[PDB]
Subunit: 644 residues, 3 copies
Amino acid sequence: APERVFSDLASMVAYPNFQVQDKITLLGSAGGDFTFTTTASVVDNGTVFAVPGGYLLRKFVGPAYSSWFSNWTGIVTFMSAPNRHLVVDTVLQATSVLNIKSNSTLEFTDTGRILPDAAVARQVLNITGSAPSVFVPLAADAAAGSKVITVAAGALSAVKGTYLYLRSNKLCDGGPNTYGVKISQIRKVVGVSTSGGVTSIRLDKTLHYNYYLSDAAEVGIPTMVENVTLVSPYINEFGYDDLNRFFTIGISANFAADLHIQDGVIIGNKRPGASDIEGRSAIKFNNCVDSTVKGTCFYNIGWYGVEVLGCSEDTEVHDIHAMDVRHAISLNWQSTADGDKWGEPIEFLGVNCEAYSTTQAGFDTHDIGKRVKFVRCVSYDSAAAGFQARTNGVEYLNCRAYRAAMDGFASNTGVAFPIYRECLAYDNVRSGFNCSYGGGYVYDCEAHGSQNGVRINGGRVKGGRYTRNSSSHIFVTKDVAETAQTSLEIDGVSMRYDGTGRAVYFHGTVGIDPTLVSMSNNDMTGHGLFWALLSGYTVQPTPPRMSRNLLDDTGIRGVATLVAGEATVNARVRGNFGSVANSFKWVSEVKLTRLTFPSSAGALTVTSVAQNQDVPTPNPDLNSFVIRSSNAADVSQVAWEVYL
Amino acid sequence: APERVFSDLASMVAYPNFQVQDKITLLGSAGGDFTFTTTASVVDNGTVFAVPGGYLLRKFVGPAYSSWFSNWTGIVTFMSAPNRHLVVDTVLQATSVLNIKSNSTLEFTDTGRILPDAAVARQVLNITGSAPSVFVPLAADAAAGSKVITVAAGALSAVKGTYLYLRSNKLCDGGPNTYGVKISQIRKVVGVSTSGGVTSIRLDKTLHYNYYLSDAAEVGIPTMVENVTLVSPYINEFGYDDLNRFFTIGISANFAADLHIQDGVIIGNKRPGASDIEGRSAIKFNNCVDSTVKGTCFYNIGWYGVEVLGCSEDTEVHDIHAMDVRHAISLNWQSTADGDKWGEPIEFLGVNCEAYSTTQAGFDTHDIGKRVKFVRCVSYDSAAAGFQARTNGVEYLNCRAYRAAMDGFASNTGVAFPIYRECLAYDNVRSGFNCSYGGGYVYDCEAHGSQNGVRINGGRVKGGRYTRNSSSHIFVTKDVAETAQTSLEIDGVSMRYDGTGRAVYFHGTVGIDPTLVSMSNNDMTGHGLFWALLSGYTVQPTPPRMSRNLLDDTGIRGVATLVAGEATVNARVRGNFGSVANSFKWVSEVKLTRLTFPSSAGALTVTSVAQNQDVPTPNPDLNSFVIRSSNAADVSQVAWEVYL
Amino acid sequence: ERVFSDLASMVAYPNFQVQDKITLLGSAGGDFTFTTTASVVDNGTVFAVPGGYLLRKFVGPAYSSWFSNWTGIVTFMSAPNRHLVVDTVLQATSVLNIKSNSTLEFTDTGRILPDAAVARQVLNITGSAPSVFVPLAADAAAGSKVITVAAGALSAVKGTYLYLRSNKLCDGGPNTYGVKISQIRKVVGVSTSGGVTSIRLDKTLHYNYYLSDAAEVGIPTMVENVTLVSPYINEFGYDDLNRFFTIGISANFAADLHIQDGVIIGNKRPGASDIEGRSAIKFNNCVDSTVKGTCFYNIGWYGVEVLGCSEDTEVHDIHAMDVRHAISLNWQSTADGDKWGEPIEFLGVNCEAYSTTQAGFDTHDIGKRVKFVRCVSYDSAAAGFQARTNGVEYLNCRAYRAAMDGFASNTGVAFPIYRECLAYDNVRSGFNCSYGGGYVYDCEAHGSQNGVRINGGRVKGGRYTRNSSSHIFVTKDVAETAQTSLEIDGVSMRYDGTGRAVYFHGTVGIDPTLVSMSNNDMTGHGLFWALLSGYTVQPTPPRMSRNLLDDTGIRGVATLVAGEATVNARVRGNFGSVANSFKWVSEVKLTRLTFPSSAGALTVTSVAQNQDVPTPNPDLNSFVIRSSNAADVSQVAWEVYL
């Protein structure tokens, strides 16, 4: 006195003559210090409470806490304004969507949880801006690289620091784009200037496509939700499936800039091991810029872990863990069955992500999107592929895929040249790398334990090591005979024999011309006569160009001494001189160099290749060739080396 | 009673009855609880207020908040002592520099800003130590790799856990060091032992140079500012240019250890698009150790985004985003025009940084600095190069340069061997990689859409793939004829013909000898007789050594059958036998190997190469060569393969 | 208005009543409530007083400055769901144990100073192994999402863990102590049917759990979600107060343990010798846990020790100075009985070790899927990196000035992979993998006695310079080890005034024909590209294709005259028969440029090498192109290789 103290809220709210300078205190589960006022205030029953005469305002600096609030509704209310920092330190029971606004932070303590409504499977968190409500056209073409776009003076108000959404009817070009999605981008206004009836707006970042007037290039002002941080969000909890408690999408964002999601866990918008539900993504970024997800764990998810779509630019996914999901990460298309759509993701980075037991590819893109990179990601036990590229030129560095039901890494129909650098595939059922749909670049990669190491129709396999492939290490083939075969270069690969499949398998069945392949400097040791596998040929095909490969490691070098311009040499010289259709006619390259220089030196040649035919098993140490001189007096000492 | 409660500052400061045992409270926009005292106390009108009889001390645990201070001056006062943790939760209007001291934390809420003084363009934050006042000489020479240094006993007091500054008159050796900067290093004392009039000081990290007594090797005690953390600094704000509100240097650090800057945004110390202003770097690290910048966004900066100079050691820059700046990151030299200068950066890492529209190179070093690495950095639309290396052996991993006005990646005058690993250059005007000033190592790189893929005078181009280069993929040239051509190895490179430039271009004009190049196992498919481009030669030069390259993919392998020692084969065998100055004399390498072994077998050779001359366009499938045996009776079946 | 001037006062007042306003001034300041409900005293948040207790009122975290002594802190942290900020300098006299869902956070000022009277452990995060196991109902192969046990056999609660094990031996490396396999998994699905319960796991199984191996499973007690933010353990000057500790932060059966930044110093005297088991941070059977940015000084044992079946462990951006090993993956001694667990899936990235008494980064002989990415070692007393488990992979790592080798494997270790690694001034060698082969890809070694020591595998690419003996030394650790095929392709082994290109070790049975050298730059080594020693019979050389030996006098055009032409070029060779030498000659590639009717088959003969004194002039070496047709007058283009 002047000191008011209550032991419950019902008390504090029921007091009838609060004075604007009372010292008000509340003791209990939501306790604290309040201030009376008659100023109109938004009631949320957490920070602002209604009472006879007016309101009670909580006194505090720093963030607010969920444990202050009477109910989920109050939470929702409190978060509906921008600039709000909340710490979820209690177990919230959701009955509606929670929308986050600009410059807001939702932070979880280890105890905090948002549990979805068991009565209605719906969305949990929305971070939601909106597309511009009117567009104006560009006053002139703006090429890729432009820092400035121009509009008619007066046409729109370009406020420095805000965003713009541009679009045209030019199609997205990251990949095949079969839905014919159109181009768009989001940029920030950092400079504005009018002169001569044109406004020039300088953008933060340059344009990545041609924005032409012939394509109806326009621009408008989107309402963006910016600067949102979700710290350790915990959505749902184990045992959700016995309560039949689900949700649709966990965290859905659209038109958001600088949305950063750190750690947290998201569980169960499907039953464990259950099948997939279209659209039930854990986190969804649609038209998001400069947004990231780092270290979040996803369990038991109906659709994608992280879904990136629209003109999402500069998005990073780091260190995530996803178990029992359709795709850990997926860059998506948009169906235009119901009209026009704009945006493919541009500049996407996945780094250090782990996916287990996905029902479809572990890490995937659809058929649009530009500049996609996967770095040090790994896939385990996928029901499909470890990694699937469906847009053009996806890059993978040091990725790994184990025990995929299908392929470790794969492109798809009409996709062009993914790049795999030092990627490892282990024990995937069908193949390590399947890029027979339209070439690939397989550089310093490894594939072990599949039917075939690499399935390829054109491109390059440079370096790397292949083992334990039942059929062959490299399989030259196509997805369908209508696809084109192109040049294939196989240079510096270890494709040794280890008692399983052969080195290379040429697929005659679908129109493979072996001469379109060049094999240089590869270690094919131990395959003997069975380095190649051929099938589907009706005429013996010409073999590929083959320079200095290794086929054997014994009796592959030596010195002979000519006698009357001849010398028989026992070595592991080999060849096939038959004419079976599915086979090559070939023979060992034998490099000859003279080491003594008699006056009767003649021109050297290899003739009479003989191969031991013992039974049941032939002995290659008894193969032999003859070194013959063009001079019949030759008694040179000649060094020899056997290659393939 | 015994408690006195006020309703604003003015009242609470005036009241004269304050006694050491009152409980004191304040209502209002900076409310709290206080404790009166009469000990000395530094006023800041935040946590300490001067009053009749003594000073009121705000009592709180945790950090302080900017919202409690009356003005910028008290904030500055507050942060002027070490061990401060302040949360900027308001928009501060600066009118002086803010110095941060050791063990302090400056932290911004989404709302917090520091706006620079519109009246005076000055620096914003300083983190400033000082060089030593006096030096003592080393008792003995101390070689690179020394864990210990020695000084005369009692020369200086080395306190364990503090730092030392070492220097000599040896010149920095990282690069050309044209200003003649001298070596210096900073080390932390972790062990001390005195014996026989000689103190041995153990360092945390070893020495990276040789500190000799003949070079005046000496050592003193710098005053360091250590363990400072800036969390999410927001300096200036969009629209600054319309208020003519700027600043010079955003965050300046000298003699700092463990300065960590986390996210935040720094805007406009220049107008948008405007020209550069010397020295207006957003962040500057001079003589800093183990300091970092991570995730900060830079807009409209007159100088460098992050400027690193001095003997700054072990600095890392991660995930930055720099738009409209001179250099996103620059390691600097020091001008010695007005005196001796010490220190080059040692151990630098830039990773996953993004630069847009820089007025000069996106990522730059000057001509000093050791161990400089760029990992997965990207430059867009530079006015100069994407990447500029002016110190020796700068290493680039998986970096990307798009659409630079000049070269994607380049070194410079007297700069030696940068190393490019799996770096990609798209649509840079002049070249992808320009390392003609003094050699390069270009490993598995890619350059598309330039005049020349790579300009190089010596080094290696190993693997990689080059497309859409109007002049040539590899251009063997020099910056100036005085510069020395060294050996160049071009191995396994894809330089296919795509309707633009040639494969290799040899620059006779600046003294290029083509026999100092070896081309081995490259894919030159489709260039026909035009794989080389020569100019500036007065005399037909000898060609480089060429081993097993590919020039066509049709008519390049078959079997022929001799008849009376001969056979004419139709194949894309090729050559130039002319003697024109700007061309080579050359011919295909045709590999021949026998497949049937008659008694008339002789030595094989190629002769009579003939090349169809149809008009208007020649048809190389009517080209031909002859296989002839030294034995006129030979009827062997000879396999053949055509290489370059 | 119950207001006290200090502590003692607030704890002597007999009158506290159910609902008052209690306030404390002074250094421990705060507001309190009264109650008689049992509470656990800690003289920080809970106080004992005549009549019952006083509870401090607060939201958010608790502060060390609130506490009377180290003991209450320990009490406070001994319950789960605690958040404490160490904003003071705490003086420890016991071990502090941290429990599930807790966070210990230090301000720039906070410290935990170890007991100077007793060297002990500082922080413990410890769970415990399962008290009982039940056997698996059926075999569970690698890749299984599920395991089965008899219905009723154990209660699998969703969200909790399982510890599985079998008598199968760990298979990551040589595993000489014969450690057995185990793994910890989270239950995410449970279903019972036909007397058999099927448990679904978060992650799949990485071994074969067979019944023939007594595969069994049990319910460990884990400590989960612990975060240590900037821990400061000890302080410089500790050695003058003789203040140490044993293990700084020791964890066992922890899940999601994260240590961020911080400093740990002095469980050993500066520069002093090592003390067994005194690791700064130790992770034993921990899952999904990490250490990022922490600094280590003066550590008796290892910086970060990872042992047991720790799976999915990562260490980033640490700096370790004067430690045994900055990171070590360990084995478990079985001398005193059976042991379970090798690390699986370990990532080291961007880590820096300075001045280690032993390897900078090491594993022992168990461990699967181990990766070091961009780590660097400076001045190790031993190796920079030592791999003792099979297939360790290094990406872009660097070793400077190690007393022995920049990178090495060890006895019975198989094929480490080095990708774009850099070795500078390591005394003995850059890469030493002569124990069981190696894959050395685009690596670089400068300033050792030998660039690469290797018995088998591959050197592809890379560049080697300033190696006194040779760039590549083909050798074994011991003659009993097998030599396998070695490929040396595309390597730059240029002569620069020091060593030779390749050194074949006859002394330990190296047969050079098991080596192939293709497309290498061996420019400048002249007749001395190879070094041999220990041979008693001239051995046959390795297969060699198109390498480069000189860069002058190596391409021309010659004109035949009556079937012959004497060419001056840098053709070379040895035709001698000294045991320690090869019999070899340059590869001279011939192509015809004019096609006279008299054209015949070409050959190289009459190789001659200038013998001037003191120093020979190789520009006067020569060879002869000869045609099989004596009339031949062709122009012949020639190129000289090795």
